[PDB]
Design a protein around this nucleic acid. Structure first.
Lengths: 71, 489
DNA sequence: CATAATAATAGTTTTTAGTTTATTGGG
DNA sequence: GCTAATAAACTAAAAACTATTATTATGG
């Protein structure tokens, strides 16, 4: 889960859109490519439930996942 | 509008309660007594803000504070209550009729103008906000204008005064029901329902005065005065007033915070709210709690416009409330909303807001269903022009289901069961639901207010049957249920 | 300081709002 | 082999219905 983001409706102030991952360090690019040929084989439930991006873990209780038990 | 609906019960004493008078029943005394008793019970269960008094036009020996001749004053204007029920039970049935014979008797001489005099006195007696004043009267004597013409003229004059005063009078069929034959000439001053009056439908409480009015602060610039109201109510348990089981004396249950240790009366000040979570008791305070609930001022801040097409059954919450346009400090509210309703064919895109109920409490997103001026041809404003407050849920308002997605069956099942359900079409009736616990409770209250032998258990329309639909439709539903081992295990 | 000044600051019963009340529950 | 997950009821509750008295203005 990259330190940056992985790879009217305008009411006010939603979560972060994204963050750079391509122009980032060439070492970061190499590691990202290896872990992405892994990702197509293993993208994990840790990201399937919600992909960890620094953009999307800011505003609201989306992590808190507002819900109660089933009847 | 608050107001006490004063109702007077004029019942004869000479023969109109005792002569068949073009009928064959017993003395109308008993039927009239049971009718008025029923309506008293209906008020007790349904309306205790309406004053009642019973008068006997015709009186051999006067029972009257007015002391006027031919006046029998039994109950003064007052809200319905058990003393009056006992009072009438004295004169209920043929036993009550022979009582009436005992203390004053029937065949009683009448004084019509004096009756109007004394009932006017009774009306003058009230000292409270009055909503309505009606004279309720039954008489076999539909047209006793055979009296002296002076009495008839004076009575008509008094009628003109009282209806001019606003006093209302009702005479209803007792001799020649229907065909306008009843009141052969006492139709002059008066211009059926026995079944309803005996039926005494009750337990109906409804709004009397305005309440909960706000403004449509749609933007930071515009507000629009409005009012929030309810017509769907959750029936309550009547208040358990703790009475001394011996002496019927109320209870001063002195409940307070305190200390289990040092025997001192604590206060909200020297105490603090707290939240035992994880490794930290998260402390709070009463005003801290209010602030945590204190978000914004009450009113309607417009958050958008959504079509009346996204709204679905799963898009539902607590029963919706209503908004009527109001003009107390916002001119044009009614005018602009009239524009909205005329262009409501295009305004299926209804208003969106996060409604703030009051101060110190948070707003909540509640949609607004545009209520038109749906005035019926009989001039009933069903759904008065306004907005129904269907409440927008949150992710809070969810309790998830599993996902065992089920697939449709063969269309012959759908067709045969469509034929079933439309053949078994239950007659639509919105005013058809009465709760058996509620009804039986009313019956226990009224019955165990007198020495009634038993409170009837009201068989309600809400009760399903076994054969009424099995004769309107039949077992062809089960025969159509052709699958092996039907759910009739 | 003159002395009946005649508005708000509640008085009201409001219904209607969060109250543990409750049992199926992991062995 | 065990042990909630509720929800009947909580027990309450904030609403102007109403406004007399003070208002401090003007005879005294």
């Amino acid at each position: 889960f990259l330190p940056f983001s992985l790879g009217g409706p305008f009411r006010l102030g939603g979560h972060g859109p994204s963050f750079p991952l391509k122009g980032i360090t060439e070492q970061q690019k190499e590691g990202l490519e290896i872990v992405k040929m892994v990702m197509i084989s293993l993208e994990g439930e840790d990201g399937l439930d919600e992909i960890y991006s620094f953009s999307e873990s800011l505003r609201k209780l989306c992590v808190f996942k507002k819900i109660e038990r089933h009847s | 509008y608050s107001g006490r609906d004063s109702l007077i019960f004029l019942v004869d004493a000479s023969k109109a309660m005792f002569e068949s008078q073009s009928e064959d029943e017993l003395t109308p005394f008993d039927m009239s007594i049971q009718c008025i008793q029923s309506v008293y019970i209906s008020k007790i269960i349904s309306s205790d803000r309406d004053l009642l008094a019973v008068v006997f036009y015709g009186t051999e020996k006067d029972k009257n504070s007015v002391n006027f001749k031919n006046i029998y004053v039994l109950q003064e204007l007052d809200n319905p209550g058990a003393k009056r029920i006992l009072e009438l039970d004295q004169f209920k049935g043929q036993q009550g009729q022979k009582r009436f014979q005992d203390m004053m008797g029937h065949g009683s001489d009448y004084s019509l103008s004096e009756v109007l005099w004394v009932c006017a006195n009774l009306f003058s007696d009230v000292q409270f906000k009055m909503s309505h004043k009606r004279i309720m009267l039954f008489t076999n004597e539909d047209n006793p204008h055979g009296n002296d013409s002076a009495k008839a003229s004076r009575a008509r004059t008094k009628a003109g005064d009282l209806r001019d005063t606003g006093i209302f009078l009702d005479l209803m069929h007792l001799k020649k029901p229907g065909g306008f034959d009843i009141s052969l000439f006492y139709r002059d001053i008066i211009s059926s329902k026995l079944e309803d009056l005996l039926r005494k439908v009750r337990a109906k409480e409804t709004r009397k005065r305005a309440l909960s009015r706000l403004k449509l602060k749609l933007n930071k610039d515009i507000v629009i005065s409005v009012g929030i109201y309810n017509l769907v109510q959750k029936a309550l348990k009547p208040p358990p007033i703790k009475l001394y089981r011996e002496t019927n004396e109320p209870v001063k249950t002195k409940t307070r915070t305190f200390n289990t240790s040092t025997g001192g009366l604590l206060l909200p000040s020297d105490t603090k709210r707290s939240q035992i979570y994880g490794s930290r008791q998260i402390i709070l305070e009463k005003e801290e709690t209010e602030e945590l609930k204190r978000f914004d001022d009450p009113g309607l801040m417009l958050m958008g416009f959504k079509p009346l097409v996204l709204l679905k059954k799963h898009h539902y919450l607590r029963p919706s409330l209503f908004v009527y346009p109001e003009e107390s400090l916002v001119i044009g509210s009614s005018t602009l909303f009239s524009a909205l309703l005329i262009k409501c064919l295009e305004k299926e895109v209804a208003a969106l807001c996060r409604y703030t109920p009051r101060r110190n409490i948070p707003p909540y997103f509640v949609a607004l269903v545009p209520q038109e001026e749906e005035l019926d041809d009989q001039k009933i404003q069903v759904t008065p022009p306004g907005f129904q407050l269907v409440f927008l849920p949150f992710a809070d308002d969810k309790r998830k289901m599993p996902f065992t997605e089920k697939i449709m069956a063969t269309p012959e099942q759908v067709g045969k069961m469509k034929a079933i359900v439309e053949k078994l079409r239950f007659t639509y009736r919105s005013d058809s639901f009465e709760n058996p616990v509620l009804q039986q409770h009313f019956r226990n209250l009224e019955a165990l207010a007198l020495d009634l032998m038993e409170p009837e258990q009201a068989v309600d329309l809400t009760l399903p049957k076994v054969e009424a639909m099995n004769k309107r439709l039949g077992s062809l539903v089960d025969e159509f249920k052709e699958l092996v081992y039907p759910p009739d295990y």
